[PDB]
């Protein structure tokens, strides 16, 4: 609810890569809250957006993106080339208990470290 | 690549809930591979589907669903009432290195256990 500085410890392919974040207000147009890394130039922002909906059903949406850049010869600032979009949506109903929601949550949280997905992401060979 | 029995250990709101899976072939229409729990009745299947695409960009899609049921008075078999859909899509480019993909992967994998998301899922109060 009352969000603060989320910092994740030691993630990314191995070992020693921490990740700090800061809140960046609430977008009142649709309720999306934003989290961002204190980068050097604000066009290079590791950003994580979360949201929730209201009724039908529910649309809990987490949309994470983190572009990278390169000092291309021809511009003053460094410039973005590629994106790294990722998004995940959760759909529930009015009558779902606490157990089902927690089950789906940590099931996805544990299944994202299974070797099936690390093959299917870092080398993209399917099943 | 060569997929086998994925079983996750001790997930869901607390403690003692394991989860076995089995492969269920490859759907040749679009390449989607399926994983499923050996349930009693095959209409109640904890299922996880994975896929990948080919070019533009990439569309690595993980679509997980697990209905629950109740013995409603009026039918022989138990019947499904609600769903618990969840899906997550990853979009990359041709020029993304290994580092960015692994970073986005385990960043989402660690961020799904942050207290922000457990509030926003199990009690749905936003930021």
């Amino acid at each position: 609810a009352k969000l603060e500085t989320v910092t994740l410890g030691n993630i990314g392919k191995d070992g020693k890569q921490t990740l700090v974040l800061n809140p960046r207000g609430v977008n009142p147009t649709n309720g999306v809250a934003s989290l961002s890394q204190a980068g050097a130039v604000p066009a290079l922002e590791k950003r994580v957006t979360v949201s929730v909906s209201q009724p039908k059903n529910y649309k809990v949406q987490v949309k994470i993106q983190n572009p990278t850049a390169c000092t291309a010869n021809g511009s003053c600032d460094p410039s973005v080339t590629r994106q790294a979009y990722a998004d995940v949506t959760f759909s529930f109903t009015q009558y779902s208990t606490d157990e089902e929601r927690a089950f789906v949550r940590t099931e996805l949280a544990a299944l994202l470290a299974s070797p099936l997905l690390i093959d299917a992401i870092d080398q993209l060979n399917p099943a | 690549a060569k997929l086998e029995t994925v079983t996750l250990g001790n997930i869901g709101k607390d403690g003692k809930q394991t989860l076995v899976l089995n492969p269920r072939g490859v759907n040749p229409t679009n390449g989607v591979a399926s994983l499923s729990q050996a349930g009693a009745v095959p209409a109640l299947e904890k299922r996880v589907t994975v896929s990948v695409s080919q070019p533009k960009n990439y569309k690595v899609q993980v679509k997980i669903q697990n209905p629950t049921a109740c013995t409603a008075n009026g039918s022989c078999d138990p019947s499904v009432t609600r769903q618990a859909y969840a899906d997550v899509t990853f979009s990359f480019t041709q020029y993304s290195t290994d580092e960015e993909r692994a970073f986005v992967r385990t960043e989402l994998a660690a961020l799904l256990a942050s207290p922000l998301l457990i509030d926003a899922i199990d009690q749905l109060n936003p930021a």
Partner: antibody, heavy 109, light 90 residues
Framework: LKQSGPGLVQPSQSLSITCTVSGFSLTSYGVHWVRQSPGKGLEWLGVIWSGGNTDYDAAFISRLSIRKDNSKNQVFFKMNSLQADDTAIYYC????????????????? | HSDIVLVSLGQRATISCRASESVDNYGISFMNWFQQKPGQPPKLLIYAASNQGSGVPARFSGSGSGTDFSLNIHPVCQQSKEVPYTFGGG
């Protein structure tokens, strides 16, 4: 948490300890190991977490193999050539990789 | 790197360390506190140097910035955490 391992071993051999966990899920946490002797208070946190196999204590690289599993939560480790003056009691711990402001989960043995 | 530290009305333990260990945006002071009973593993005291450990009574607290820490327990082991979490006793 649970704890089971053979004790009172003759010196200059290997020595292994297993541990399970029945609380959290081992994927998004970490396991810590300390010794406690009558000589010193308690010692290193050369440990592993997240599934990423990681660092050790600086003095004891020459020993201390470590493994992490997900079959059911086995975090069993071993020691090669147990020197005879390594007389202590070994303790395991949990750790959360989840800094959130300052309220942050930590050290339930 | 290492550090050194030492019926009513309370007393307190002091501290001395080299690095102030201020790695992040003010959730920084990773200094901790431990007391143990003999037949038990050591229960967790206040973590992050001022933040009222999980399941502790309210009479325990700590305060102070980096390399300057304190206790206050007036009605009635130390460790630091930068990279290898080495420390000593008291």
């Amino acid at each position: 948490l649970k704890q089971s391992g053979p004790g009172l071993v003759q010196p200059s051999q290997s020595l292994s300890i297993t541990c399970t966990v029945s609380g959290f899920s081992l994927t998004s946490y970490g396991v810590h190991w300390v010794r406690q002797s009558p000589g010193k208070g308690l010692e290193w946190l050369g440990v592993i977490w997240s599934g990423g196999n990681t660092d050790y204590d600086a003095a004891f690289i020459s020993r201390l193999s470590i493994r992490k599993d997900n079959s059911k939560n086995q975090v069993f480790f071993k020691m090669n050539s147990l020197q005879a003056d390594d007389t202590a009691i070994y303790y395991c711990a949990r750790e959360s990789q989840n800094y959130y402001g300052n309220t942050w989960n930590y050290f339930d043995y | 790197h290492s550090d050194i530290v030492l019926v009513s009305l309370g007393q307190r333990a002091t501290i001395s360390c080299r690095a102030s260990e201020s790695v992040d945006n003010y959730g920084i002071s990773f200094m901790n506190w431990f007391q143990q009973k003999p037949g038990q593993p050591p229960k967790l005291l206040i973590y992050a140097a001022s933040n009222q450990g999980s399941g502790v009574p309210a009479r325990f607290s700590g305060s102070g910035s980096g390399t300057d820490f304190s206790l206050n327990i007036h009605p009635v082991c130390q460790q630091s955490k930068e990279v290898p979490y080495t420390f000593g006793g008291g």
